mmCIF file of N, CA and C in Angstrom:
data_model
loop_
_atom_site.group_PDB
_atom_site.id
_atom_site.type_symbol
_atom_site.label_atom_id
_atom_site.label_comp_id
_atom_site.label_asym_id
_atom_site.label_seq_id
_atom_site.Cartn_x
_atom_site.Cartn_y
_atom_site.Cartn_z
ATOM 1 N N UNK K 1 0.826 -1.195 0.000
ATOM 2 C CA UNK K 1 0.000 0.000 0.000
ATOM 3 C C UNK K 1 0.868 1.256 0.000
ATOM 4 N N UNK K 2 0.075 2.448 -0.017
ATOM 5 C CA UNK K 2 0.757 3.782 -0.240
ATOM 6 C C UNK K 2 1.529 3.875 1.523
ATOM 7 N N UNK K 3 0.723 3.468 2.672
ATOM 8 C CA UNK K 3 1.449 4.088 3.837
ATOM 9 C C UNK K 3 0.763 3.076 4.863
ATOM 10 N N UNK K 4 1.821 2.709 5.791
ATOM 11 C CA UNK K 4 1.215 1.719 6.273
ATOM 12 C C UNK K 4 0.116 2.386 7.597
ATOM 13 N N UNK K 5 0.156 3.597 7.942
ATOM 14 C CA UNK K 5 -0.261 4.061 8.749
ATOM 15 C C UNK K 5 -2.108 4.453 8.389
ATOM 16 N N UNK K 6 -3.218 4.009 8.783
ATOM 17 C CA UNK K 6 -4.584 4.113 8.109
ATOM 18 C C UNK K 6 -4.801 5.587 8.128
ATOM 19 N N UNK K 7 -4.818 6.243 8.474
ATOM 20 C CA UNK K 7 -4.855 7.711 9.281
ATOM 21 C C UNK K 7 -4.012 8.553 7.349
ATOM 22 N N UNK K 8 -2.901 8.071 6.914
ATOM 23 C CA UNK K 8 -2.315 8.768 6.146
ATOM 24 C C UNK K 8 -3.518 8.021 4.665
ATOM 25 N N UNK K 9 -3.848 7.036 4.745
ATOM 26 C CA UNK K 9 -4.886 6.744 3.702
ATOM 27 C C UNK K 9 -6.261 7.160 3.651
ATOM 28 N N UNK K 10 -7.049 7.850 4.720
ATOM 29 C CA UNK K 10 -7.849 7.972 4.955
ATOM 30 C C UNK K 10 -8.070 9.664 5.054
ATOM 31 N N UNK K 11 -6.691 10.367 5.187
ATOM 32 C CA UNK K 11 -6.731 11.596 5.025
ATOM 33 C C UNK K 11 -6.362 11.834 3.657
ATOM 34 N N UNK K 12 -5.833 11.441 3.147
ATOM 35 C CA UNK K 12 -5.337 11.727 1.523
ATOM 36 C C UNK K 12 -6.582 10.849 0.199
ATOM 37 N N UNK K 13 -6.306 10.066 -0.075
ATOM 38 C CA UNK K 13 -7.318 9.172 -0.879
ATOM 39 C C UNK K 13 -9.277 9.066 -0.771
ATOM 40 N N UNK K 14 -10.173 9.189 -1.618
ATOM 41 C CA UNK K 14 -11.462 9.674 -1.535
ATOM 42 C C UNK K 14 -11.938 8.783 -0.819
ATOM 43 N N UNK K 15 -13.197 8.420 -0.647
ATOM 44 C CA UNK K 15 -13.799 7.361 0.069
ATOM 45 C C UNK K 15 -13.957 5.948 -0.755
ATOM 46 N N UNK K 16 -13.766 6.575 -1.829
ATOM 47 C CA UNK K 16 -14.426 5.225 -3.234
ATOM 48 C C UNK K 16 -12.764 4.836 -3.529
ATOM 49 N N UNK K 17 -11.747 5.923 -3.178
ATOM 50 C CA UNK K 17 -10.303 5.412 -4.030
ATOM 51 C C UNK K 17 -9.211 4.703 -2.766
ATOM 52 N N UNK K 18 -10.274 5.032 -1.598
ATOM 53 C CA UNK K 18 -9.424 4.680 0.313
ATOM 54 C C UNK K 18 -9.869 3.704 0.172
ATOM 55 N N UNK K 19 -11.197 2.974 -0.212
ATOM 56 C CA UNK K 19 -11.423 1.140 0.116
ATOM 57 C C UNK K 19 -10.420 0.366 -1.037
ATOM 58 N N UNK K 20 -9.755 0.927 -1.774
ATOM 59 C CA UNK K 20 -8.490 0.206 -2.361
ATOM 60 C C UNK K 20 -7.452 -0.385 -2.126
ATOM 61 N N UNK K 21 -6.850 0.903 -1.099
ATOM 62 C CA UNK K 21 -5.630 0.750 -0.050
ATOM 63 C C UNK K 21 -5.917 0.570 1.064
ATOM 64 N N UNK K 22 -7.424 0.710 1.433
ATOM 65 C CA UNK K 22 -7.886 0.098 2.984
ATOM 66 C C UNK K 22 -7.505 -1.824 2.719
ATOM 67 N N UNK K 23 -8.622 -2.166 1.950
ATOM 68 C CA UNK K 23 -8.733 -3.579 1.668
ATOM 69 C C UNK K 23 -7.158 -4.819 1.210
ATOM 70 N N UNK K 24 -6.191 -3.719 1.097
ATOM 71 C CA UNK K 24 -4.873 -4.053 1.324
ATOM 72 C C UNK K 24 -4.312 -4.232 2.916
ATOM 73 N N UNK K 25 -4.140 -3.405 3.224
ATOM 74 C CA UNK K 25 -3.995 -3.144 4.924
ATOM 75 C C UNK K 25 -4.606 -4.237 5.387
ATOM 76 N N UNK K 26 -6.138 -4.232 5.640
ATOM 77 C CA UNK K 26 -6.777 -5.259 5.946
ATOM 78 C C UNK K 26 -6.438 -6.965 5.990
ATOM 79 N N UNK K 27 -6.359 -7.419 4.349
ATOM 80 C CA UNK K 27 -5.846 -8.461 4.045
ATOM 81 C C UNK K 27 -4.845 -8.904 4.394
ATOM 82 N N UNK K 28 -3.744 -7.990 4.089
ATOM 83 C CA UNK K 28 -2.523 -8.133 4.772
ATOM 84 C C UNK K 28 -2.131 -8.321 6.578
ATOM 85 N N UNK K 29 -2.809 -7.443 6.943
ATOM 86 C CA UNK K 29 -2.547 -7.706 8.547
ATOM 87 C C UNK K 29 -3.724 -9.011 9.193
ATOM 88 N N UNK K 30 -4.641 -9.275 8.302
ATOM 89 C CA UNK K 30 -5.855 -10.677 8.562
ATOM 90 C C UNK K 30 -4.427 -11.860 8.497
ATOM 91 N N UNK K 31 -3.667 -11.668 7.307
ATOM 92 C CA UNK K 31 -2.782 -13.175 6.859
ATOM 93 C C UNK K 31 -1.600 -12.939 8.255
ATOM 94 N N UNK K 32 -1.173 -11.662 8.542
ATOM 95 C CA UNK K 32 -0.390 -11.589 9.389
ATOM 96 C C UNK K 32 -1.063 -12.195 11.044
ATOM 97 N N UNK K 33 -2.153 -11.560 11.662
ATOM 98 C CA UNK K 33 -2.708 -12.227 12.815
ATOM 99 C C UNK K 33 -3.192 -13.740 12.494
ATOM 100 N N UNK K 34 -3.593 -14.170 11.264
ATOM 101 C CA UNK K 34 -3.835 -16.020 11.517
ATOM 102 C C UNK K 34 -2.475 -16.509 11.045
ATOM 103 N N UNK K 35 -1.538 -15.869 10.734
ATOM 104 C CA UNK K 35 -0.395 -16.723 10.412
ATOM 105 C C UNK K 35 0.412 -17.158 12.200
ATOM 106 N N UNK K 36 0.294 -15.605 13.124
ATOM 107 C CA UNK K 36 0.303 -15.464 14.284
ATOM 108 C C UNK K 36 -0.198 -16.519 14.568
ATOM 109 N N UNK K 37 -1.763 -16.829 14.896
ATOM 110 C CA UNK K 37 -2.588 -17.404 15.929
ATOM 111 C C UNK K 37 -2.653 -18.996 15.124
ATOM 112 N N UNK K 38 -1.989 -19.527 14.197
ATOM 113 C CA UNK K 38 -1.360 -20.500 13.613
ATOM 114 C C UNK K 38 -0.082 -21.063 13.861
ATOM 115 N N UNK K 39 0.643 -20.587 14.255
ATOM 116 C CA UNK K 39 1.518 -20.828 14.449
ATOM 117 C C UNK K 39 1.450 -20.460 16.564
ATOM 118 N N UNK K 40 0.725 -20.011 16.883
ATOM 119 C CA UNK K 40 0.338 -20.437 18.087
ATOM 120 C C UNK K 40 0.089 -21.716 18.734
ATOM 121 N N UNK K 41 -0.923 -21.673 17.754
ATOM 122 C CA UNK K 41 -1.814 -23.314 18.249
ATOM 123 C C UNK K 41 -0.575 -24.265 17.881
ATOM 124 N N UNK K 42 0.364 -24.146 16.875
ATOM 125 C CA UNK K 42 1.268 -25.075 16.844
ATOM 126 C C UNK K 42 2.367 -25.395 18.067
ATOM 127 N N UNK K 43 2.482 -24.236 18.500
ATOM 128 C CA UNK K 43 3.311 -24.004 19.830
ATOM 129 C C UNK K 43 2.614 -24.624 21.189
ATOM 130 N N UNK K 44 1.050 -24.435 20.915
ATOM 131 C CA UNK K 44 -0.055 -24.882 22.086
ATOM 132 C C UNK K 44 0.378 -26.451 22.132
ATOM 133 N N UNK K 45 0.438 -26.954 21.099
ATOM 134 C CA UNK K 45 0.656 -28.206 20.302
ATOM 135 C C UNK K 45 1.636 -29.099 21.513
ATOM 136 N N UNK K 46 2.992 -28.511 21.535
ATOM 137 C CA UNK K 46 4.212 -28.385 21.653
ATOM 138 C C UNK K 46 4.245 -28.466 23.080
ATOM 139 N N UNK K 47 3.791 -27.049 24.046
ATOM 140 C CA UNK K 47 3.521 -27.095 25.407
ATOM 141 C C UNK K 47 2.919 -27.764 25.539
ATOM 142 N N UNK K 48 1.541 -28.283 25.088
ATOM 143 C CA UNK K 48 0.880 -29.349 26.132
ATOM 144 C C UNK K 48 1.209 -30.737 26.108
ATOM 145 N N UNK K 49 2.010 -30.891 25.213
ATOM 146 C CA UNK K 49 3.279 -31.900 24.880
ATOM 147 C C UNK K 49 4.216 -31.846 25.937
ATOM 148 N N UNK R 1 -2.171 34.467 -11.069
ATOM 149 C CA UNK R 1 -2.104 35.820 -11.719
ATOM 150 C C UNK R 1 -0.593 36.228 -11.869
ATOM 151 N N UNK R 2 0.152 35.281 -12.416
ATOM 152 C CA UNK R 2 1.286 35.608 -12.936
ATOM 153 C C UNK R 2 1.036 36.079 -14.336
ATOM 154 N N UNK R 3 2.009 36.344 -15.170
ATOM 155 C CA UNK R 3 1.862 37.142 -16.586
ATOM 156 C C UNK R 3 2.201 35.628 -17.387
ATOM 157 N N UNK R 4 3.414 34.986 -17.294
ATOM 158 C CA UNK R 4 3.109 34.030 -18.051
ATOM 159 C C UNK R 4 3.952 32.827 -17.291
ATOM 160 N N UNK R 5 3.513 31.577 -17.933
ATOM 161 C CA UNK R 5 4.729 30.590 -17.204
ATOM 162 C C UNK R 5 5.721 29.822 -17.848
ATOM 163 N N UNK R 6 6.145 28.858 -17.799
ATOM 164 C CA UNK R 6 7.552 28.376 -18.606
ATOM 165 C C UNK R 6 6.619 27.158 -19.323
ATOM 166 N N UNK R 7 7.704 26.456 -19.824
ATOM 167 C CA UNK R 7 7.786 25.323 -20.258
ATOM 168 C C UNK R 7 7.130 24.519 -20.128
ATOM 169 N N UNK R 8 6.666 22.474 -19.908
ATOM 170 C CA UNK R 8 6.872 21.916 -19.439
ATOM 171 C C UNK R 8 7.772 21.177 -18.759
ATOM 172 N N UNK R 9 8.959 21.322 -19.712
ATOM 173 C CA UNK R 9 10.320 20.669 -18.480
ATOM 174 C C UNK R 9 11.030 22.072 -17.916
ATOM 175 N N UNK R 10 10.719 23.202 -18.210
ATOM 176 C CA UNK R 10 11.353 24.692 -17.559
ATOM 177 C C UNK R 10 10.322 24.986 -16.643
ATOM 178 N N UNK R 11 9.122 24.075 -16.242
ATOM 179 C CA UNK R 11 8.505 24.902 -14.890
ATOM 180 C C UNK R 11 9.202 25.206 -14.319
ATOM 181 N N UNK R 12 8.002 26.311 -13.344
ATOM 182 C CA UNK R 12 8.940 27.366 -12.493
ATOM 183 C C UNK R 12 8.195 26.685 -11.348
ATOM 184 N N UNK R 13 9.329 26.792 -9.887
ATOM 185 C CA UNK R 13 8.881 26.034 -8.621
ATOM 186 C C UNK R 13 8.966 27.043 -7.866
ATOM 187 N N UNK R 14 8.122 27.284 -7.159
ATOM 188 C CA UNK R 14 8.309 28.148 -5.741
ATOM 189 C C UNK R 14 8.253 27.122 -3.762
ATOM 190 N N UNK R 15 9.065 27.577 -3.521
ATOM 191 C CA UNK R 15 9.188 26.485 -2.281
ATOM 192 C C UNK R 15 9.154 26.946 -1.192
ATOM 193 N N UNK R 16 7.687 26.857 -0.234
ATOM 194 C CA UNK R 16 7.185 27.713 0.912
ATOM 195 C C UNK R 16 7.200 26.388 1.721
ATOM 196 N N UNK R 17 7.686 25.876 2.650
ATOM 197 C CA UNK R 17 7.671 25.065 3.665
ATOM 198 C C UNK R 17 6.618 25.152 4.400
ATOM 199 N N UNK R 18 6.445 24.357 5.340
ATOM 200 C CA UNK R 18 5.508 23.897 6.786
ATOM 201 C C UNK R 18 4.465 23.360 6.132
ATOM 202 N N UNK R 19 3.362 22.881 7.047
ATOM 203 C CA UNK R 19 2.250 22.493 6.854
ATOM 204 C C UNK R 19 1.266 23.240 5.776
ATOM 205 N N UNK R 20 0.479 24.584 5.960
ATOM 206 C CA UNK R 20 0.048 25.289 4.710
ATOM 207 C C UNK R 20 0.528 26.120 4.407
ATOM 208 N N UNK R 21 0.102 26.346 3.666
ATOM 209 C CA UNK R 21 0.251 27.209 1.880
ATOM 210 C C UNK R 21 -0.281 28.551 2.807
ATOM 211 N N UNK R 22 -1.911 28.232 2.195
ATOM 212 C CA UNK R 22 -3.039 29.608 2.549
ATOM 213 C C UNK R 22 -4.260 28.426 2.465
ATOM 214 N N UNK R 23 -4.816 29.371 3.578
ATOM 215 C CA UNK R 23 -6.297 28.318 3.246
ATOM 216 C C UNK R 23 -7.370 29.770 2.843
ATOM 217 N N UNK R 24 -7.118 30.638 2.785
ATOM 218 C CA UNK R 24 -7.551 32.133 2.650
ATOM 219 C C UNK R 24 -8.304 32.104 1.294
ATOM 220 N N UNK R 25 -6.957 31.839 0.305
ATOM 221 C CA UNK R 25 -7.213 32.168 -1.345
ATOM 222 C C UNK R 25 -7.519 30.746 -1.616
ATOM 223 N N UNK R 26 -8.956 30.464 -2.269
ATOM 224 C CA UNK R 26 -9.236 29.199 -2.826
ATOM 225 C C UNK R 26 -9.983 29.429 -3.942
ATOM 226 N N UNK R 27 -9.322 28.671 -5.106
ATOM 227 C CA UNK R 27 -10.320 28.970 -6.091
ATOM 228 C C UNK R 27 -10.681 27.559 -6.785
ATOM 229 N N UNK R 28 -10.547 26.506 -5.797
ATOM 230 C CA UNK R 28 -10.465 25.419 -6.279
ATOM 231 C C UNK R 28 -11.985 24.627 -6.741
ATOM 232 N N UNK R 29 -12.712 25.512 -6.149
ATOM 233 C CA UNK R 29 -14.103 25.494 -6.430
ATOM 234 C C UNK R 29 -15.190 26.034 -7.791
ATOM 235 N N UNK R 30 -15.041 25.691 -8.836
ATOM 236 C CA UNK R 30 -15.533 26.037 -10.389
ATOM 237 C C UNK R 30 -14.836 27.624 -10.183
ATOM 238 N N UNK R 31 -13.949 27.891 -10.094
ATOM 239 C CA UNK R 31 -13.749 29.179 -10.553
ATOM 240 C C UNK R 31 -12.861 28.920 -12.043
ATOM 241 N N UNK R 32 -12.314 27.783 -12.668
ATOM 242 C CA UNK R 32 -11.681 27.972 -13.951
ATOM 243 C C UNK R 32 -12.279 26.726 -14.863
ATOM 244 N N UNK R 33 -11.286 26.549 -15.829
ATOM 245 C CA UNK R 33 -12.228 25.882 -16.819
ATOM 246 C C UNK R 33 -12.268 24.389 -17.036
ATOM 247 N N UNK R 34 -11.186 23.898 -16.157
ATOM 248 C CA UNK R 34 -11.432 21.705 -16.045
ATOM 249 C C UNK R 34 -10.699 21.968 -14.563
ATOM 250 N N UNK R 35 -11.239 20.679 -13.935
ATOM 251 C CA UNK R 35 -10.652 20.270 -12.936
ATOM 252 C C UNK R 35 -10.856 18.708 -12.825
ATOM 253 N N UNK R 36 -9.568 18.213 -13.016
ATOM 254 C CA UNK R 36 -9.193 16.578 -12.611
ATOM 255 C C UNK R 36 -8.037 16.822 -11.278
ATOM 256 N N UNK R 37 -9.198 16.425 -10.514
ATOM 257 C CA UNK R 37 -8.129 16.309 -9.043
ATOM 258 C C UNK R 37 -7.751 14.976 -8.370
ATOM 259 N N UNK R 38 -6.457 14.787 -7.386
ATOM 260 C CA UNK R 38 -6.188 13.370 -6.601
ATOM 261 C C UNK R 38 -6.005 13.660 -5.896
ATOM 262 N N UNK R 39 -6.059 12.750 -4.415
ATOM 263 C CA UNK R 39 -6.356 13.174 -3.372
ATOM 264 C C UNK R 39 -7.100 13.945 -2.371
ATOM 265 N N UNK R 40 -7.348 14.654 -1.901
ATOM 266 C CA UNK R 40 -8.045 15.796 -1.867
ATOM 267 C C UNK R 40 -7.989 17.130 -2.068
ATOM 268 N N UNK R 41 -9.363 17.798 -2.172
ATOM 269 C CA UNK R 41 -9.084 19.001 -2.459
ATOM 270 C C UNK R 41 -8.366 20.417 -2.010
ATOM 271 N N UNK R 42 -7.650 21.088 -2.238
ATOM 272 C CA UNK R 42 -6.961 22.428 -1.510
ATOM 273 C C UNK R 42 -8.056 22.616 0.487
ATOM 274 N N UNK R 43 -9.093 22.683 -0.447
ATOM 275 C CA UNK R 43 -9.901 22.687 0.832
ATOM 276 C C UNK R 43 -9.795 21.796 2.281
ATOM 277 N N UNK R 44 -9.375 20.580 1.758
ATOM 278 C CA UNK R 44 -9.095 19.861 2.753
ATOM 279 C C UNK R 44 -7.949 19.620 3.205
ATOM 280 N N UNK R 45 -6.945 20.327 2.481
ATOM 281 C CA UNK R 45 -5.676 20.497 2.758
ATOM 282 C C UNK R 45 -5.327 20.904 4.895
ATOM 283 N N UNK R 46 -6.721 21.972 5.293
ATOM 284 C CA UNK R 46 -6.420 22.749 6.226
ATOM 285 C C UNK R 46 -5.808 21.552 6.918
ATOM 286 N N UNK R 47 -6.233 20.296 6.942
ATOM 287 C CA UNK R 47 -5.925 19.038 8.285
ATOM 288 C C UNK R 47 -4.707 18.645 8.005
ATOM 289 N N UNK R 48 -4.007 18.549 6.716
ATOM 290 C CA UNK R 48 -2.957 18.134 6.671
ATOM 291 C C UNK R 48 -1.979 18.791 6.590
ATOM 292 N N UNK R 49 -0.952 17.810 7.640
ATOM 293 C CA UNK R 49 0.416 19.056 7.697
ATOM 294 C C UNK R 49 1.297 18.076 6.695
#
């Protein structure tokens, strides 16, 4: 995306041209927290092992 | 309301620092004859530094 900060996409870009670079952000940090909470449960895995 | 301007690769740059310009003089509102804009308008400039 243009900025990783939402605040700099949401002040610059329209409402129709911000769900572009919103829906990036989004996706991206969704794959980042279940890659997280995936690799958790693998660790859960591990400790209760 | 300059008299005339340069080029395309001889534009002329003027370089005023900080956050705004002027939020005073706006004519960004049908006062000339096309407007294709990005981002937002002069008007909404006041929020961004």
């Amino acid at each position: 995306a243009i900025s990783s900060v939402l605040n700099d996409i949401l002040s610059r870009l329209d409402p129709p041209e911000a769900e572009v670079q919103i829906d990036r952000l989004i996706t991206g940090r969704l794959q980042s927290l279940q890659t997280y909470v995936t690799q958790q449960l693998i660790r859960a895995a591990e400790i209760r092992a | 309301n300059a008299t005339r301007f340069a080029s395309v690769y001889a534009w002329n740059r003027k370089r005023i620092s900080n956050c705004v310009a002027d939020y005073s003089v706006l004519y960004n509102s049908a006062s000339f004859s096309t407007f294709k804009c990005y981002g937002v308008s002069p008007t909404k400039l006041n929020d961004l530094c």
